[PDB]
Amino acid sequence: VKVIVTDMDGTFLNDAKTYNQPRFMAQYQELKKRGIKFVVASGNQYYQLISFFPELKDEISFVAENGALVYEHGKQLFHGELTRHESRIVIGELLKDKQLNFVACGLQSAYVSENAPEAFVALMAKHYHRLKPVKDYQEIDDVLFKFSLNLPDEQIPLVIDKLHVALDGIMKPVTSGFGFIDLIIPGLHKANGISRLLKRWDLSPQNVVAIGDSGNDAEMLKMARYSFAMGNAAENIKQIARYATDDNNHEGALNVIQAVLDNTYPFN
């Protein structure tokens, strides 16, 4: 094991969105001593992710925005981008749905209509700490690489086909990690983001430990040699992952880290 990657909502975080900082801090210092890298891979905004690791932000790596933004040692390594024409097309399509509330995710900040219901904005603010109200989605001065819709992820199945023909591969729907639908650039998933870090570190999936719970973790868990599904993980995720651990309210992710440190099952 040379890399441990975890994803946040429903994994590293309990339902109250907190984690055991003292225990994790002690574990991290040991991982550092052993030269093992730590990576946070989540659909959440980069700026929201670092709020969870104030003391370690420049030491650990991040695969944010479900894979569209990657940071290593406090420095941006890569970011995806929709062409201006692509973003116009996607936004135009979303605007055709009158009951939809959504957020446009960019490099410098995320954006939401100044007229979107407060309840929706309040929920999104929990995942995008840099969230700016705009008067129009089409005049945004930023590079956009993701969208977050107020549609339940349970509806993905009814949504892929509609989106496939309306957007045609410009973007694909996947779970946001917190119950709703993210529209991402095809190929810019967590595994792809993790590969950029591995390539830079000259390591392989062979040395990777990944922990997840939902659909946006599929390629990450399929890629890692030591794949773990949280006890609360969705069925298809428990099927994809080779190993299991306790649920997110019982420090399931920290227990995987402990298994690495003490070399217990599955590490031998």
- List active site positions: 7
Count residues contacting Mg ion (CB under 5 A)?
7
Q: Is 74 marked as a binding-site residue?
A: no
196 contacts: CB under 8 Å, gap ≥ 6: 70, 77, 78
Q: Which stretch binds Mg ion (CB under 5 A): 4-12, 49-57, 96-104, 235-243?
A: 4-12
- DSSP symbol at 116: S
Residue 26 beta carbon to Mg ion: minimum distance, rounded to whole angstroms: 24
- Residues 66, 190 contacting (CB under 8 angstroms): yes
- Residues 190, 67 contacting (CB under 8 angstroms): yes
Q: Is 7 marked as a binding-site residue?
A: yes
Select 208 or 220, whichever has its Cβ closest to Mg ion.
220
- Binding flags for Mg ion, 171-190, as an x/- string (CB under 5 A): ------x-------------
Spatial separation of the C-alpha atoms in residues 226 and 203, rounded to whole Å: 14
122 contacts: CB under 8 Å, gap ≥ 6: none
Q: Are strands 172-175 and 208-212 parallel, antiparallel or unpaired?
A: unpaired
Q: Apex CA 103: angle with CA 99 and CA 108, to 5°?
A: 165
Residue 112 beta carbon to Mg ion: minimum distance, rounded to whole angstroms: 22
Interface residue with Mg ion, options 1, 5, 6, 9 (CB under 5 A): 9
- Residues 52, 11 contacting (CB under 8 angstroms): no
Q: Which stretch binds Mg ion (CB under 5 A): 6-14, 68-76, 94-102, 111-119?
A: 6-14
Q: Which stretch binds Mg ion (CB under 5 A): 32-40, 135-143, 207-215, 260-268?
A: 207-215
**How many residues does the structure list for the chain?**
268
Q: Is 141 marked as a binding-site residue?
A: no
Residue 72 touches Mg ion, criterion: CB under 5 A? no
Spatial separation of the C-alpha atoms in residues 103 and 149, rounded to whole Å: 7
Closest C-alpha to 82, from 71, 72, 93: 93
Interface residue with Mg ion, options 1, 10, 12, 156 (CB under 5 A): 10
Q: Are strands 172-175 and 131-134 parallel, antiparallel or unpaired?
A: unpaired
Q: Is 42 marked as a binding-site residue?
A: yes
Interface residue with Mg ion, options 72, 153, 182, 213 (CB under 5 A): 213
Residue 214 touches Mg ion, criterion: CB under 5 A? yes
Spatial separation of the C-alpha atoms in residues 89 and 170, rounded to whole Å: 9
Residue 241 beta carbon to Mg ion: minimum distance, rounded to whole angstroms: 13
Q: Is 214 marked as a binding-site residue?
A: yes
Binding residues for phosphate: 8, 42-43, 190, 216
Binding residues: 7-9, 42-43, 190, 213-214, 216
Q: Which residues make up the interface to Mg ion (CB under 5 A)?
A: 7, 9-11, 177, 213-214
Binding residues for Mg(2+): 7, 9, 213-214
